[PDB]
Amino acid sequence: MNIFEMLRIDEGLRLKIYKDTEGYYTIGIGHLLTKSPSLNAAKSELDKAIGRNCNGVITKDEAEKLFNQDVDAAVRGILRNAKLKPVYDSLDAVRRCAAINMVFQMGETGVAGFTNSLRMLQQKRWDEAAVNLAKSRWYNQTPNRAKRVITTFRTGTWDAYK
Ligand SMILES: [Cl-]
Numbered sequence: 001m002n003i004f005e006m007l008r009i010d011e012g013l014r015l016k017i018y019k020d021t022e023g024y025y026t027i028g029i030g031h032l033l034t035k036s037p038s039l040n041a042a043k044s045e046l047d048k049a050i051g052r053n054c055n056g057v058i059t060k061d062e063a064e065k066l067f068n069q070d071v072d073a074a075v076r077g078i079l080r081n082a083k084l085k086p087v088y089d090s091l092d093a094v095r096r097c098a099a100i101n102m103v104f105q106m107g108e109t110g111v112a113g114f115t116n117s118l119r120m121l122q123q124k125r126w127d128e129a130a131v132n133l134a135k136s137r138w139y140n141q142t143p144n145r146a147k148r149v150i151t152t153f154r155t156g157t158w159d160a161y162k
Contacts, residue, residue, distance in 0.1 A: 001158040003071060003097045007104055009161060010145055013063060017042055017056045021142060027056075028063035030104070031070055074103045081108055083115075087122045095121075098152040105145070106138065121153065130154040 011030030017039070020026045025033045025042035031049070033042040039056075046054050050062055058066075078084045078099065088099055102111055111118075114136070120129035130150050133139065139146040151160035 001097075001161055003100050004067070006097055006101060006158075006161060007067070007071065010101065010105075010148070013060070015058055015060065015063060017046065027058060027066075029067040029070075031063075031066045070104065071100065074100050077108050078103055083118070084108070084111070087118045090122050090124075092156055094156050094158065095153055098149050101149050101152075102138075105142075110138075126154050126156075 008029055013029050014027065017025055017027050017033065020030070020032070024035050025039065025045075027033060027046060033045040033049075036042070043054070043056050046056065046058070049066065050058060078088050084099075084103075088096060091099060102114075114133070117129050117132045120132055130153060133150050133153065134146065136146075139150070148160040152158070
């Protein structure tokens with residue numbers, strides 16, 4: 001397992017514009033296009049992202065390249081953020097994947113509410129961090145996804161994905 005396989009399992013793959021769990025236009029392996037309600041705005045964002053007139057549909061190769069860009073952007077966002085980088089650097093490789101997964105799903109702004117969880121993770125208080133992470137809108141709205149990610153933080157293994 002690696003971060004790409006983990007997120008592919010969590011996000012799936014769709015080659016036509018779809019709506020995510022919050023209702024936002026998305027494509028590929030969980031690539032958010034726009035929070036605007038306008039399908040035309042989403043189609044415009046898609047064409048800009050891919051570099052051709054897609055009319056709402058992409059190829060598997062295009063989806064995989066977008067996905068690689070999105071994972072890289074999540075990692076770079078962690079490394080540039082003074083609050084997230086020290087926690088990330090304290091984690092082992094499996095738990096670092098769980099961190100990238102959360103940033104991919106919620107962004108740097110969405111993880112900002114997890115200050116107390118981040119401190120527990122940095123202190124390696126895994127069971128306490130797991131309980132704290134579950135006391136969140138995230139867990140209550142996407143519980144199966146959150147359970148897999150939390151189990152990865154709690155155990156440092158891939159067992160939730162196997
Ligand atoms: Cl879920």
